[PDB]
Structures are given as structure tokens and as C-alpha cells.
Amino acid sequence: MLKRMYARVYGLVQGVGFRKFVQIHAIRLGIKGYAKNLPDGSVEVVAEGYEEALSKLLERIKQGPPAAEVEKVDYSFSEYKGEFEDFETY
Ligand SMILES: [Cl-]
């Protein structure tokens, strides 16, 4: 089943390779969407893909690359919209 996920990642998560980390792992998993740095120092992820793939990505996002310290991930699933054609960072 396809689903959409919105997640916010908090901690030491900017300037540590986090968005690229999410992208690499999303692409591996066939997930489309984006990882964005927000002005509050958090990372916003919108992801579309299969439920299992989204669970695997969530497990990655909860850890981050070695340099990151992820304190909190707040997320929700919603209905798939077929919006994205690739996984981008910005
Ligand atoms: Cl980062």
C-alpha cells in the first residue's frame, strides 16, 4: 500500500549531512518527496512510498548520520497523493 508521511526531526540535525542521508536512504527505498531544513533548526521530511518503505525510512531518520543527534521525530501518515517524482533536498 502507498502512503504519505510528514515528519519533523529535532536535535542536532542541521549541518551534519542529515538531508543527504535521508535522500540517499529514500532513494534506495523507492521513496519520493523531500527533506528540508527549517528556520527552527529542524528538518522536515515529506515522503511518499510503500508503508514498509516508509517504516524503514523512519528508522533511519530516527538515527541520522553519525554526526547527527536526533532527539525527537514527530510524524504522521496521511493518504498518498502521487505528488513527487523524485527525492529532493532543500
Ligand atoms: Cl544536516
mmCIF file of C-alpha atoms and ligand atoms in Angstrom:
data_model
loop_
_atom_site.group_PDB
_atom_site.id
_atom_site.type_symbol
_atom_site.label_atom_id
_atom_site.label_comp_id
_atom_site.label_asym_id
_atom_site.label_seq_id
_atom_site.Cartn_x
_atom_site.Cartn_y
_atom_site.Cartn_z
ATOM 1 C CA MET A 1 0.000 0.000 0.000
ATOM 2 C CA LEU A 2 1.131 3.527 -0.774
ATOM 3 C CA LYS A 3 1.053 6.190 1.898
ATOM 4 C CA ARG A 4 2.401 9.645 2.601
ATOM 5 C CA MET A 5 4.393 10.661 5.634
ATOM 6 C CA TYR A 6 5.100 14.017 7.203
ATOM 7 C CA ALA A 7 7.918 14.032 9.734
ATOM 8 C CA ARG A 8 9.800 16.630 11.745
ATOM 9 C CA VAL A 9 13.203 15.779 13.121
ATOM 10 C CA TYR A 10 14.655 17.727 16.033
ATOM 11 C CA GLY A 11 18.032 17.807 17.695
ATOM 12 C CA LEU A 12 21.426 18.354 16.249
ATOM 13 C CA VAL A 13 20.180 17.773 12.747
ATOM 14 C CA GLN A 14 21.411 20.613 10.553
ATOM 15 C CA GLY A 15 24.969 20.977 9.323
ATOM 16 C CA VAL A 16 25.528 17.277 9.865
ATOM 17 C CA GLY A 17 24.657 15.739 6.471
ATOM 18 C CA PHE A 18 21.105 14.885 7.531
ATOM 19 C CA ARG A 19 19.143 15.837 4.417
ATOM 20 C CA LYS A 20 21.551 13.960 2.130
ATOM 21 C CA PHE A 21 21.319 10.988 4.489
ATOM 22 C CA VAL A 22 17.541 10.980 4.230
ATOM 23 C CA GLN A 23 17.717 11.344 0.465
ATOM 24 C CA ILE A 24 20.170 8.503 -0.051
ATOM 25 C CA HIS A 25 18.043 6.190 2.021
ATOM 26 C CA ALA A 26 14.790 7.325 0.496
ATOM 27 C CA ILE A 27 16.038 6.737 -2.975
ATOM 28 C CA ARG A 28 17.289 3.285 -2.024
ATOM 29 C CA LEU A 29 13.799 2.525 -0.765
ATOM 30 C CA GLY A 30 11.935 3.935 -3.799
ATOM 31 C CA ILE A 31 10.575 6.831 -1.770
ATOM 32 C CA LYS A 32 9.816 10.211 -3.274
ATOM 33 C CA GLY A 33 9.424 13.552 -1.553
ATOM 34 C CA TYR A 34 11.834 15.902 0.138
ATOM 35 C CA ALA A 35 13.916 16.747 3.124
ATOM 36 C CA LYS A 36 14.012 20.409 4.015
ATOM 37 C CA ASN A 37 15.887 22.489 6.555
ATOM 38 C CA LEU A 38 13.533 24.764 8.501
ATOM 39 C CA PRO A 39 14.344 28.014 10.282
ATOM 40 C CA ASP A 40 13.828 26.425 13.688
ATOM 41 C CA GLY A 41 16.806 24.113 13.209
ATOM 42 C CA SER A 42 14.620 21.151 12.447
ATOM 43 C CA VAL A 43 14.337 19.008 9.368
ATOM 44 C CA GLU A 44 11.010 18.481 7.580
ATOM 45 C CA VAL A 45 10.511 15.325 5.596
ATOM 46 C CA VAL A 46 7.575 14.616 3.271
ATOM 47 C CA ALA A 47 7.737 11.173 1.835
ATOM 48 C CA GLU A 48 5.558 9.024 -0.373
ATOM 49 C CA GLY A 49 6.029 5.354 -0.861
ATOM 50 C CA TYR A 50 5.013 1.961 0.378
ATOM 51 C CA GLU A 51 4.192 1.574 4.053
ATOM 52 C CA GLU A 52 7.103 -0.799 4.662
ATOM 53 C CA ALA A 53 9.500 1.533 2.892
ATOM 54 C CA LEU A 54 8.260 4.450 4.987
ATOM 55 C CA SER A 55 8.808 2.420 8.177
ATOM 56 C CA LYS A 56 12.367 1.691 7.066
ATOM 57 C CA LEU A 57 12.981 5.331 6.317
ATOM 58 C CA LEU A 58 11.539 6.329 9.682
ATOM 59 C CA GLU A 59 14.004 4.005 11.376
ATOM 60 C CA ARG A 60 16.809 5.772 9.522
ATOM 61 C CA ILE A 61 15.520 9.255 10.253
ATOM 62 C CA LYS A 62 15.330 8.421 13.973
ATOM 63 C CA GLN A 63 19.119 7.814 13.906
ATOM 64 C CA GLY A 64 20.560 10.169 11.315
ATOM 65 C CA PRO A 65 24.091 10.051 10.029
ATOM 66 C CA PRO A 66 26.799 9.594 12.684
ATOM 67 C CA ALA A 67 27.337 13.322 13.186
ATOM 68 C CA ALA A 68 23.662 13.944 13.928
ATOM 69 C CA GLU A 69 21.968 13.750 17.277
ATOM 70 C CA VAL A 70 18.291 13.097 16.771
ATOM 71 C CA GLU A 71 16.334 13.878 19.936
ATOM 72 C CA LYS A 72 12.812 13.642 18.611
ATOM 73 C CA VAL A 73 10.914 12.618 15.484
ATOM 74 C CA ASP A 74 7.290 13.708 15.246
ATOM 75 C CA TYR A 75 5.436 12.236 12.355
ATOM 76 C CA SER A 76 2.107 11.362 10.856
ATOM 77 C CA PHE A 77 0.883 9.328 7.955
ATOM 78 C CA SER A 78 -1.687 10.531 5.503
ATOM 79 C CA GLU A 79 -3.138 9.462 2.213
ATOM 80 C CA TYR A 80 -0.851 9.007 -0.817
ATOM 81 C CA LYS A 81 -1.247 11.719 -3.454
ATOM 82 C CA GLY A 82 1.251 10.638 -6.131
ATOM 83 C CA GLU A 83 2.822 14.056 -5.968
ATOM 84 C CA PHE A 84 6.599 13.561 -6.192
ATOM 85 C CA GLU A 85 8.712 12.118 -8.976
ATOM 86 C CA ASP A 86 11.995 12.028 -7.060
ATOM 87 C CA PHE A 87 13.514 12.772 -3.651
ATOM 88 C CA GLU A 88 15.000 16.198 -3.229
ATOM 89 C CA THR A 89 16.689 18.236 -0.586
ATOM 90 C CA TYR A 90 16.284 21.896 0.051
HETATM 91 CL CL CL B 1 22.349 18.342 8.081
#
